[PDB]
């Protein structure tokens, strides 16, 4: 009876695919809770204690004082974002001097993350190196196909509509990869393609200036739809919408920014379908 701990479901659902039945995977954070400000609850310390490996996002996602006590200096911790940064697997995004942790919306980056999960798991359990690797090979090639599917579907969004207004800044990596051109990527003008009244963390206070910023962006770019997120307070986007002159609506289905609906993979699919359809594209089969 062996236990491996993942901080959240975006990590846990990939770890569980590599290991299958040969281990018990537990997840610390799930459901409608903000991972950014998660504080450990009773029993969480014991979940870490009984586990063989603790898989973290890094990049400041586990930044609460509770988690920092238990994770900083812990030899069980696999810091997926730091390991990916250790190889320039991706270019870190930031906002006003804090790192952007939301790399799991970019399926190429999260594939690299899963590569580190598999390696880390295999390094801890050489006796499972072979089943682990087989399953890793499978999920990794499924994620590459998922990534191609997303890029192709999101490419059908008319360029005049490639402007993503969300609750907080959880889709910067998504936007840079899937909504922006090579020229916008190299220049950095890809950043014109997404905005949100809240920053990287839902915990920050949203001001009338943030409302106004997003309202002017909506009117400058003729954005017709904005996207609510599951578990994020909806007051700010609802105010932004009401403060229009000028057609503007809420997207039909919510996006999943910091959490998972059924599983991480179906959630990515749902997000891509939702964004593609509402911004005027056509989802590939
Ligand atoms: Ca421990
Ligand atoms: Fe977030
Ligand atoms: Na402000
Ligand atoms: Na306008």
- Tokens (6 digits) for 267: 């959630």
If you search the block for the tokens 């997404």, which residue do you land on? 194
Expressed in angstroms and rounded, the spacing between residue 99 Cα and the centre of ligand 1 is 26
Measured in angstroms, how far is the CA atom of residue 8 from the centroid of ligand 1?
A: 17
Cα of 169 vs centre of ligand 4, distance in Å, is: 23
For the chain, report the end-to-end CA distance as a whole number of angstroms. 41
The residue among 57, 259, 268 whose CA lies nearest residue 143 is 268
Residue 12 is encoded by which pair of tokens?
């846990």
Residues with CB under 5 A from ligand 2 (ion): 170, 258
Task: Report how far residue 239's alpha carbon sits from residue 236's, in angstroms, rounded to the nearest whole number.
Answer: 5
Give the number of the ligand closest to the Cα of residue 45.
Answer: 1
Give kind and range of the element (H or E) at residue 164: strand 164-165
Task: Name residues whose C-beta falls within 8 Å of residue 226's C-beta, 6 or more positions apart in sequence.
Answer: 165, 166, 218, 237, 240, 241, 248, 249, 250, 251
Q: What are phi and psi of 255, to 5 degrees?
A: -90, 155
From residue 227, alpha-carbon distances to 3, 53, 246, 275, 277 in Å are 37, 36, 17, 8, 12
- What distances in angstroms separate CA 143 from CA 3, 172, 222, 262, one per listed residue? 25, 19, 33, 17
* Distance of CA 95 from the midpoint of ligand 3 (Å): 13
Of all ligands present, the nearest one to the C-alpha of 77 is 1
Q: How far is the CA of 177 from the centre of ligand 2 (A)?
A: 18
Q: What is the DSSP letter of 225?
A: E
Q: Which ligand is nearest to the CA of 76?
A: 1
Q: Minimum-distance ligand to the CA of 199?
A: 2
> Rounded to the nearest 5 degrees, what angle is found at the Cα of 202, between the Cα atoms of 201 and 206?
110
Q: What resolution, expressed in A, was reported for this entry?
A: 2.0
- By CB atoms closer than 10 A (0-12, 13-18, 19+), residue 46 is exposed
* Residue 273 · residue 235 · CB < 8 Å: no
What is the Å distance from ligand 4's center to 246 Cα? 8
Å from CA of 86 to ligand 2 middle: 23
Cα(207) to ligand 3 centroid in Å equals: 5
CA of 218 to the centre of ligand 4 (A): 7
**How far is the centre of ligand 1, averaged over its atoms, from the C-alpha of 52 (Å)?**
8
E strand map for 94-161: 94-95, 98-99
CA of 50 to the centre of ligand 1 (A): 7
Task: Name the strand (E) or helix (H) holding 251.
Answer: none
Ligand closest to CA 223: 4
From the CA of 259, the nearest ligand is 2
Q: How far is the CA of 221 from the centre of ligand 4 (A)?
A: 6
């Amino acid at each position: 009876s062996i236990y491996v701990l993942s901080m959240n479901r975006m990590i846990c659902d990939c770890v569980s695919r590599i290991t299958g039945d040969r281990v018990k995977n537990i997840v610390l954070i799930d459901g409608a809770i903000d991972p950014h400000s998660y504080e450990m609850v009773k029993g969480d310390e014991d979940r870490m204690a009984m586990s063989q490996l603790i898989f973290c996002n890094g990049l400041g996602l586990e930044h609460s004082a509770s988690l920092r006590k238990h994770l900083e200096g812990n030899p069980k911790v696999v810091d997926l974002g730091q390991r990916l940064l250790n190889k320039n697997c991706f270019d870190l995004l930031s906002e006003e001097g804090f790192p952007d942790p939301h790399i799991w919306t970019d399926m190429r980056v999260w594939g690299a993350a899963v590569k580190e999960m598999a390696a880390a798991l295999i390094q801890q359990f050489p006796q499972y190196e072979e089943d682990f690797q087989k399953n890793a090979d499978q999920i990794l090639s499924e994620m590459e196909e998922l990534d191609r599917w997303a890029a192709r579907s999101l490419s059908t969004i008319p360029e005049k509509n490639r402007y993503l207004v969300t609750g907080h800044n959880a889709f910067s990596y998504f936007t840079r990869r899937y909504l922006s051109s090579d020229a916008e990527r190299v220049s950095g003008e890809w950043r014109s393609r997404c905005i949100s009244p809240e920053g990287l963390s839902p915990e920050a206070q949203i001001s009338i200036r943030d409302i106004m910023r997003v309202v002017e962006y909506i009117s400058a770019n003729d954005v017709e739809v904005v996207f609510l997120e599951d578990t994020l307070n909806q007051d700010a986007l609802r105010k932004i919408v009401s403060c229009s002159k000028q057609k503007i609506r809420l997207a039909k289905s919510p996006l999943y920014s910091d959490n998972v609906c059924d599983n991480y993979f179906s959630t990515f699919q749902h997000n891509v379908r939702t964004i593609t359809e509402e911004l005027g594209g056509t989802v590939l089969e």
